[PDB]
Amino acid sequence: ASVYAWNRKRISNCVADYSVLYNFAPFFAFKCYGVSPTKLNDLCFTNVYA
Amino acid sequence: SALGKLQDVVNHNAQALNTLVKQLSSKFGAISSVLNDILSRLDPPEAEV
C-alpha cells in the first residue's frame, strides 16, 4: 500500500516463470535495462531481490 | 647463470605471450568480458556498442 518501507523478497530454488510474468493480460507495462525481456525469460540467475 | 642470455630470450617470449593471453579478461569498459554472455543477455542494437 505504500512506497515507504516497501517489500523486498528473495526468490530462489524455483522456476521463475517469466513466460507468465510480464506476459499475462493484467500486466500494464514492463521494461528491462541491461537485458532484453525474451532473453530474460531464457536466462537463469543466482537469486532475485524483488 | 652462465647462460643468462639464452634464458633471457626464452623468458621474454614467454612473458609476452602470457600477458597477451591474460589481457583477454579485461573488460575495457564493457559490461562483461565474455562475448557469449553479451550476445545472450542483450538486444542487437545495444550489444553492438
CB contacts, 8 Å: A35 with chain B: 41-42
Which method was used? cryo-EM
Chain A nearest-CA residue for B44: A36
- Quote the minimal CA–CA distance from B25 to chain A in Å: 20
- Resolution in Å equals 3.3
CA–CA distance, A18 with A20 (Å, rounded to integer): 5
Partner A contacted by B41 (CB < 8 A): yes
Own/partner long-range contacts of A7-12 (Cβ < 8 Å, ≥24 apart): A8/A49, A8/A50, A9/A48, A9/A49, A9/A50, A10/A47, A10/A48, A10/A49, A10/A50, A11/A47, A11/A48, A11/A50, A12/A46, A12/A47, A12/A48
- Quote the minimal CA–CA distance from B41 to chain A in Å: 5
Chain A nearest-CA residue for B30: A34
